Amino acid sequence: IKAGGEWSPCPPPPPVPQWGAPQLLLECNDLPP
């Protein structure tokens, strides 16, 4: 056992975000023929 003064239980990995940027949202183009 390392006898340093520092240790703490590990937090869970951060859930990964969505494709939206910090937001852009892709939209179907609506133009008639």
């Binding site: 703490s8 239980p9 937090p11 869970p12 990995p13 951060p14 859930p15 990964v16 975000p17 969505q18 494709w19 939206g20 937001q23 949202l25 892709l26 939209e27 179907c28 183009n29 609506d30 133009l31 008639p32 023929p33």
Partner: protein, 199 residues
């Protein structure tokens, strides 16, 4: 550069049937196929984007995504579930590029409701109340049975545990406590033998 339509055409040049439409590129342009009505789409359709490469094969209402649907984003992340007003809402499932799976409720395009997130690297699962794509309360379960019940920080705190109780199945000990700012675990009493947190 009017977009080309191939399929049945109603009066006034309004598409009215099962056909395919291709749009002019500004990198190919987009392409829709499926039922259309009076210039707007309705029913089970498939829209393939040009620049990004996303493909949405799902229902349509009033020219917007609505009802059950399934999308493959530019990143290999695949969503599958309910849509309202071309925004992810209601119950569904999401598969991330990392392999992490999420089952639960969405609201305004984020994780929100009662859901479970399963990581790929470590088999740990987060189960409970999500808000704004973050974990608020519930049970964080390891791959063997050891777990932690309590309140997790929001999206601001990156879903870190803040207060609650640890249970370790290797030794079968239960300890209740909280986390300091530095991350050090501070317990309120000495550990005691117990059992898993089955709500």
């Amino acid at each position: 550069p009017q977009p080309v339509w191939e399929g049945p055409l109603d009066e006034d040049g309004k598409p009215h049937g099962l056909g395919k439409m291709e749009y002019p590129p500004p990198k190919p342009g987009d392409k829709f196929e499926g039922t259309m009505e009076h210039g707007v789409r309705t029913g089970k359709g498939t829209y393939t984007w040009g620049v990004s490469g996303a493909v949405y094969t799902g229902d349509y209402v009033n020219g917007k995504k609505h009802g059950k649907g399934k999308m493959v984003y530019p990143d290999k992340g695949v969503y599958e579930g309910d849509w309202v007003e071309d925004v992810m809402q209601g119950q569904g499932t999401y598969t991330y590029p990392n392999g992490d799976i999420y089952q639960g409720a969405f609201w305004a395009g984020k994780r929100h409701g009662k859901g479970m997130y399963h990581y790929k690297g470590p088999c740990c699962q987060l189960v409970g109340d999500w808000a704004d794509g973050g974990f608020t309360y519930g049970r964080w379960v390891y791959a063997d049975g050891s777990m932690f019940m309590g309140k997790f920080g929001g999206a601001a705190a990156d879903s870190k545990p803040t207060a609650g109780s640890y249970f370790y199945s290797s030794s079968s000990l239960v300890q209740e406590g909280h986390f300091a700012k530095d991350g050090s675990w501070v317990g309120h009493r000495d550990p005691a033998v117990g059992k898993e947190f089955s709500v």
